[PDB]
C-alpha cells in the first residue's frame, strides 16, 4: 500500500541519488505494456507482482 | 527505571552488567571505561544514557572482585576460588569475541570492540543510526559446497 | 600488512582522545586500527585492487561516510557482479579493448586481461550502497539537466539481471510479471533434448 | 499519434506538479492536514496527483 | 543458577540454604544437618551462589 | 536550561555523585568511592526535553560532501567561502522523520560550511 | 453520536472531544528539571523570580516545612490550549492526587 | 485574562492574581469591586459562610508510627506500588513505540 520502499540507504536502487522522492524513483511506471518497461520499472513491477 | 545495559556472555549462566565486564578486563576506573565507550565527551545525551548502567554496578570496583562476580556464575557452584577466577579469565579470553583474538593480552582489543558494540547500541537507542534490516543481502552470506 | 606500512595506527598504541575525529578501520569485522585521512586511503586501496596488486579482485571495500568507518571484507560467501568503471564522465573501456577482444581467439586477450587492466570491477551487494551506477553510457552524456553527473560505474547490460529460465522469455518487458514467473516455472517442464 | 501525444502531455503535467510539491516541502511551505503528519500528508498529495 | 549447595563440612548435598535479609544487607547460609551457619554482607547484586562462595573462602582461609 | 554533564573524581576518576551539605545548605559533588568532595556549579541535576528539539547541524559531518550518491545543486552559493556548488539532503533521524527540510553543506575542500533553510 | 446543537457546530463537538480524550501530564509538558533551591526568595533561575517572590512572601504555605529540593516544569502554549486547558485545573489535580 | 482575584488580603491589599477560573489562595474567583466586595450579594454571602466554616474548623520511647505517619512515607507508598510502576513502564514502552516509529520511508 505504500510506494516502493528505500531498501538501499535512502535509495530505492543505486541508479538514483539519495533522498529522491520523484515519481520515477519510488516506482511510477510511465509506460504501457506495449511500449516496454525500462529496467527499473521492470524491477519495481516485479516487486509488486511478488 | 533508568535504562541499564547488560551482556549475555557464553557459558555464564546469567546476564551480567557490562560495566562489570569492563572491570573484569582490567579497565577499572570509570573514566577509562567511558574512554572506550564514548569516543567524544561532549554529547551529553549519550552520557546520561550511560549513567544508569554505570551506577548499577558501582559496588564491584576491582578486577579480581569482578572476576569473582563473573566466575561465581559458570561451571559448578562449589569450587575453589582460584578455579573460579581461572574460569572467568578463560571465558573472557577464549570464548568472548574470538574473532577479535583468542591469544592472551588481547584485552585492549577486546575492550575496544566491546565498547564499539555498546556505542552502536547507544546510537540505535538515541536514533542516530537505523536498526539493521535482516533481509538486506549485504548482511547475508551464501554458503556454498 | 599493507595497512601497517601505510599510516594506520594500530589500536593498542592510541590515546582514546584521538578516535573522535579519525576514521575507524575494520578488516573482516575486527577493529584493526584507525586512520586520519580516509579518502586518500580509499583511493590508494581501490587503485591497488584495480592493478591486481596484493588486494585480490573479490575484496569488498566500503566507506561509511556519515559515520566514520571503513570496512574491508575478504570472507567467503559474498555475492558480486562485474560493472564498468567510469572516469570523470567517461568509461575506461575504449575501443582498443573491443578490438583486442574481437579476436579473443588469437591474442588470448581474455576476460582476465580485461579485469587486470582496471576496466571492470566486481562490486558486491554492500559496496553497492556507495556507488552511483549509470544504467547505460547515455546517462553519462551531459544532459540539459544533468541528473547526477558524478557517476562511478555502469551496467554492462541491464538484461543480465535475469536468470537461466527467465532469460528465455522474449520481450519480457511487455509482459505482466506473474506471467514471467509462471513461464520461468514451466520452462523447467518442457520436453526437449536434455543431454 | 494524437492520443499518444495527449497521454504524454498528461504524464509530463503530472510529473511537473509532483516536482512542485516536492520543492514546496523542501522550503517548509507545506503544512499538515488534520490527523496526519507532514510525511503522510506529503505522500497522500503525491499519490493523489 | 540454583540455590541449594553441598554443606562444606558434613558433605551432605543440597543441605545448605540461604536467607537474604535485603533490609540489613546480610545473608545467612546454614547447614540443616550440622547446623553450621555462616554470616556475611550482601549487596543488591549478590546472589546465593555469591554468598555460598564467600563461605568456602572463609572456610579455607581460616583453615590455613 | 542546557544539558548537564558528569564530572569525575580526582583520585578515582569515578563519577562524582551529588548530595547536599545540610548544615550549609549548599550543593556538593562527592565521591561515593573515595572520600573526595567538591563544590557544585549548576544547582540543577536533571533535565528532560519532552519535545526533543534537537538541531541536526551538530550531527552533520563536513565530510559528507564527498558522496557521489548524494545530490549536488548549483543554486545555493556558499555563504562562507563563496563557492558555487553545495550538496544537500534530508534529516533522516528518528523523531525527525517529519519536516522534509533540507540541510546544505559546501562542497569546496576545507571550507566545510554548513547551513539550512 | 452527538445529541444537541453539538451535532451542527464544530466548536461544541471539539469541546466534547477534548472532554473524552485522555490527557496525561506528559502530553502538555515541555521540559522539566530538578533544581537545588534552598532559598525560594532567591531562585537559581532569573525569569521565574518575579512570580516566585509574588507567591512566597505571603505565608499561606509554610517556608520552614519546605525542603530545599525543587521540581520545575515547563508547559508549552499550543499544546496547553489545544485541550482548552489552564494551569488552574492542573494545580487542582496535583492537589487532589497527592493531597 | 482580565478579571483579578481581588480578594482582601491580610495586609489590606487586594489580590492581583490573573487566574482564569480560581484563585489558589481565595478559592473560586468571583467578580469583586474596587474595594474587594463581590458584586453579587449572594456570592458575598456564600464566601462569608465558607470563611466562617473555615474559621470554625511508653511515651518516653520512640514510636515507630512516626516514620510510618509522615508525608514522605505516604508518597513513597503511593509511588512505589506495583500498579504504579507497571503504569510507568507501560507509558515508557509507548514512548519506545514512538521511537520505533522513527523509520518511515526505509525498510524499518
Ligand atoms: Zn553440614
Ligand atoms: Zn574517587
Ligand atoms: Zn563553503
Ligand atoms: Zn488571590
Ligand atoms: Zn487567594
UniProtKB/Swiss-Prot annotation, chain E:
Protein's name in the database: Transcription elongation factor 1 homolog
A GO biological process held by the record: transcription elongation by RNA polymerase II
Residues given in the record as Zn(2+) binding sites: 7, 10, 31, 34
Domain of life: Eukaryota
Compartments (UniProt record): Nucleus; Chromosome
GO cellular component labels: chromosome; nucleus; transcription elongation factor complex
Function noted in UniProt: Factor involved in transcription-coupled nucleotide excision repair (TC-NER), a mechanism that rapidly removes RNA polymerase II-blocking lesions from the transcribed strand of active genes. Acts as a key adapter required to anchor TC-NER factors to RNA polymerase II: stably positions UVSSA and the DCX(ERCC8) complex (also named CSA complex) on arrested RNA polymerase II, leading to neddylation and activation of the DCX(ERCC8) complex and ubiquitination of RNA polymerase II.
Keyword Transmembrane: no
Family membership noted in the UniProt record: Belongs to the ELOF1 family.
Entire protein: shown range: 20 to 83 of 83
Organism: Homo sapiens (Human)
Subunit and partners: Associates with RNA polymerase II.
Alphabetically ordered keywords of this record: Chromosome, DNA damage, DNA repair, Nucleus, Zinc
Primary gene name: ELOF1
Impact when changing residue 60 to A: Does not affect transcription-coupled nucleotide excision repair (TC-NER)
Keyword DNA damage on entry: yes
A single MF term (Gene Ontology): RNA polymerase II complex binding
UniProtKB/Swiss-Prot annotation, chain F:
UniProt entry keywords in alphabetical sequence: Acetylation, DNA-directed RNA polymerase, Metal-binding, Nucleus, Transcription, Zinc, Zinc-finger
First and last residues of each zinc finger (C4-type): 9-34
The organism's place on the tree of life at top rank: Eukaryota
Coarse class of the protein's main subcellular location: nucleus
ZnF bounds (TFIIS-type): 74-116
Record InterPro entries: DNA-dir_RNA_pol-M_15_CS, Rpa12/Rpb9/Rpc10/TFS, Zn_ribbon_RPB9, Zn_ribbon_RPB9_C, Znf_TFIIS
Protein residues bound to Zn(2+) 1: 9, 12, 31, 34
One CC-aspect GO term: nucleolus
Residues the entry annotates as binding Zn(2+) 2: 78, 81, 106, 111
Biological process (GO), any one: transcription-coupled nucleotide-excision repair
SUPFAM superfamilies: Zinc beta-ribbon
GO molecular function: DNA-directed RNA polymerase activity; nucleic acid binding; zinc ion binding
Family the entry assigns: Belongs to the archaeal RpoM/eukaryotic RPA12/RPB9/RPC11 RNA polymerase family.
Function, as annotated: DNA-dependent RNA polymerase catalyzes the transcription of DNA into RNA using the four ribonucleoside triphosphates as substrates. Component of RNA polymerase II which synthesizes mRNA precursors and many functional non-coding RNAs. Pol II is the central component of the basal RNA polymerase II transcription machinery. It is composed of mobile elements that move relative to each other. RPB9 is part of the upper jaw surrounding the central large cleft and thought to grab the incoming DNA template.
Subunit structure: Component of the RNA polymerase II (Pol II) complex consisting of 12 subunits.
UniProt-recorded name of the protein: DNA-directed RNA polymerase II subunit RPB9
UniProtKB/Swiss-Prot annotation, chain H:
Phenotype when changing residue 15 to A: Defects in transcription-coupled nucleotide excision repair (TC-NER)
Localisation: Chromosome
Effect on the protein upon substituting residue 26 to A: Defects in transcription-coupled nucleotide excision repair (TC-NER)
UniProt binding sites for Zn(2+): 5, 15, 23, 26
Origin superkingdom: Eukaryota
Zinc finger (UVSSA-type): 2-29
Compositionally biased residues, Basic and acidic residues: 30-57
Family of the protein in this entry: Belongs to the UVSSA family.
Free-text function comment from the UniProt entry: Factor involved in transcription-coupled nucleotide excision repair (TC-NER), a mechanism that rapidly removes RNA polymerase II-blocking lesions from the transcribed strand of active genes. Acts as a key adapter that promotes recruitment of factors involved in TC-NER. Facilitates the ubiquitination of the elongating form of RNA polymerase II (RNA pol IIo) at DNA damage sites, thereby promoting RNA pol IIo backtracking and access by the TC-NER machinery to lesion sites.
Disease: UV-sensitive syndrome 3: An autosomal recessive disorder characterized by cutaneous photosensitivity and slight dyspigmentation, without an increased risk of skin tumors.
Oligomeric and partner information: Interacts with the elongating form of RNA polymerase II (RNA pol IIo) during transcription stress. Interacts with the TFIIH complex during transcription stress. Interacts with ERCC6. Interacts with ERCC8. Interacts with USP7.
Record-given protein name: UV-stimulated scaffold protein A
Amino acid at each position: 500500500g505504500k510506494r516502493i520502499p528505500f531498501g538501499f540507504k535512502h535509495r530505492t536502487l543505486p541508479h538514483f541519488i539519495k533522498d529522491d522522492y520523484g515519481p520515477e524513483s519510488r516506482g511510477f511506471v510511465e509506460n504501457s505494456y506495449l511500449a516496454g518497461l525500462t529496467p527499473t520499472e521492470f524491477f519495481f513491477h516485479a516487486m509488486g507482482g511478488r | 527505571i533508568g535504562q541499564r545495559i547488560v551482556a549475555t556472555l557464553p557459558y555464564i549462566k546469567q546476564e551480567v552488567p557490562i560495566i562489570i565486564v569492563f572491570r573484569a578486563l582490567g579497565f577499572v576506573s570509570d573514566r577509562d571505561i567511558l574512554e572506550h565507550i564514548i569516543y567524544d565527551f561532549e554529547d551529553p545525551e549519550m552520557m546520561e544514557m550511560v549513567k544508569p548502567s554505570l551506577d548499577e554496578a558501582f559496588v564491584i570496583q576491582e578486577q579480581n572482585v569482578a572476576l569473582n562476580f563473573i566466575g561465581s556464575r559458570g561451571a559448578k557452584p562449589g569450587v575453589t576460588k582460584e578455579k573460579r577466577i581461572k574460569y572467568a579469565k578463560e571465558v573472557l579470553q577464549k570464548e568472548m569475541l574470538p574473532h577479535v583474538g583468542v591469544s592472551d593480552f588481547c584485552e585492549t582489543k577486546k575492550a575496544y570492540f566491546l565498547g564499539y558494540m555498546v556505542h552502536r547500541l547507544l546510537l540505535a537507542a538515541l536514533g542516530r543510526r537505523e536498526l539493521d534490516d535482516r533481509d538486506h543481502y549485504g548482511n547475508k552470506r551464501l554458503d556454498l559446497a | 600488512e599493507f595497512l601497517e606500512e601505510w599510516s594506520m595506527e594500530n589500536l593498542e598504541e592510541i590515546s582514546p582522545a584521538a578516535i573522535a575525529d579519525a576514521t575507524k578501520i575494520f578488516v573482516n569485522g575486527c577493529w584493526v586500527g584507525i586512520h586520519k585521512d580516509p579518502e586518500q586511503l580509499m583511493n590508494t586501496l581501490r587503485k591497488l585492487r584495480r592493478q591486481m596488486d596484493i588486494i585480490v579482485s573479490e575484496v569488498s571495500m566500503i566507506r561509511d561516510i556519515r559515520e566514520r568507518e571503513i570496512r574491508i571484507y575478504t570472507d567467503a560467501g559474498r555475492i558480486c557482479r562485474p560493472l564498468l568503471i567510469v572516469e570523470k564522465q567517461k568509461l575506461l573501456l575504449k575501443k582498443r579493448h573491443i578490438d583486442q577482444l574481437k579476436e579473443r581467439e588469437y591474442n588470448n586477450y581474455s576476460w582476465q586481461d580485461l579485469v587486470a587492466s582496471g576496466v571492470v570491477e566486481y562490486i558486491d551487494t554492500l559496496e553497492e550502497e556507495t556507488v552511483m551506477l549509470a544504467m547505460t553510457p547515455d546517462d553519462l552524456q551531459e544532459k540539459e539537466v544533468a541528473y547526477c553527473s558524478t557517476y562511478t560505474h555502469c551496467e554492462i547490460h541491464p538484461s543480465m539481471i535475469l536468470g537461466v529460465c527467465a532469460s528465455i522469455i522474449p520481450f519480457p518487458d511487455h509482459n505482466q510479471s506473474p506471467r514471467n514467473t509462471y513461464q520461468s516455472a514451466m520452462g523447467k517442464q518442457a520436453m526437449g533434448v536434455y543431454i | 499519434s494524437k492520443t499518444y501525444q495527449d497521454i504524454q502531455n498528461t504524464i509530463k503535467k503530472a510529473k511537473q506538479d509532483v516536482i512542485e510539491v516536492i520543492e514546496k516541502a523542501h522550503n517548509n511551505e507545506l503544512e499538515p492536514t488534520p490527523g496526519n503528519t507532514l510525511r503522510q500528508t506529503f505522500e497522500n498529495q503525491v499519490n493523489r496527483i | 543458577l540454583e540455590t541449594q549447595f553441598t554443606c562444606p563440612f558434613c558433605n551432605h548435598e543440597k543441605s545448605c540454604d540461604v536467607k537474604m535479609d535485603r533490609a540489613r544487607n546480610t545473608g545467612v547460609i546454614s547447614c540443616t544437618v550440622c547446623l553450621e551457619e555462616f554470616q556475611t554482607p550482601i549487596t543488591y547484586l549478590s546472589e546465593p551462589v555469591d554468598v555460598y562462595s564467600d563461605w568456602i573462602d572463609a572456610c579455607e582461609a581460616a583453615n590455613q | 536550561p542546557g544539558f548537564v554533564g558528569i564530572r569525575f573524581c580526582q583520585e578515582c576518576n569515578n563519577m562524582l555523585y551529588p548530595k547536599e551539605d545540610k548544615e550549609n545548605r549548599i550543593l556538593l559533588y562527592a565521591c561515593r568511592n573515595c572520600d573526595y568532595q567538591q563544590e557544585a556549579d549548576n544547582s540543577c541535576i536533571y533535565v528532560n526535553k519532552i519535545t526533543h528539539e534537537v538541531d541536526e547541524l551538530t550531527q552533520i559531518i563536513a565530510d559528507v560532501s564527498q558522496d557521489p550518491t548524494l545530490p549536488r545543486t548549483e543554486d545555493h552559493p556558499c555563504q562562507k567561502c563563496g563557492h558555487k556548488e553545495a550538496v544537500f539532503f534530508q534529516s533522516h533521524s528518528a523523531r525527525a522523520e517529519d519536516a522534509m527540510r533540507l540541510y546544505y553543506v559546501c562542497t569546496a575542500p576545507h571550507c566545510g560550511h554548513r547551513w539550512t533553510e | 453520536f452527538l445529541l444537541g446543537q453539538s451535532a451542527r457546530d464544530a466548536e461544541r463537538a471539539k469541546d466534547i472531544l477534548c472532554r473524552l480524550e485522555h490527557t496525561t501530564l506528559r502530553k502538555v509538558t515541555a521540559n522539566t528539571a530538578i533544581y537545588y533551591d534552598p532559598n525560594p526568595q532567591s531562585t537559581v533561575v532569573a525569569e521565574d523570580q518575579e512570580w516566585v517572590n509574588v507567591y512566597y512572601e505571603m505565608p499561606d504555605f509554610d517556608v520552614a516545612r519546605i525542603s530545599p529540593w525543587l521540581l520545575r516544569v515547563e508547559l508549552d502554549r499550543k499544546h496547553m490550549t489545544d485541550r482548552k486547558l489552564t494551569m488552574e485545573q492542573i494545580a487542582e489535580k496535583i492537589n487532589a492526587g497527592f493531597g | 485574562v482580565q478579571h483579578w482575584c481581588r480578594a482582601p488580603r491580610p495586609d489590606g491589599r487586594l489580590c492581583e492574581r490573573q487566574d482564569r477560573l480560581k484563585c489558589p489562595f481565595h478559592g473560586k474567583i468571583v467578580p469583586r469591586d474596587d474595594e474587594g466586595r463581590p458584586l453579587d450579594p449572594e456570592d458575598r454571602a456564600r464566601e462569608q459562610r465558607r470563611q466562617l466554616q473555615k474559621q470554625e474548623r511508653y511515651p518516653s520511647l520512640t514510636n515507630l508510627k512516626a516514620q510510618a505517619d509522615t508525608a514522605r512515607a505516604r508518597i513513597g507508598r503511593k509511588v512505589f506500588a506495583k500498579a504504579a510502576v507497571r503504569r510507568v513502564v507501560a507509558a515508557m514502552n509507548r514512548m519506545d513505540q514512538k521511537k520505533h516509529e522513527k523509520f518511515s520511508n526505509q525498510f524499518n
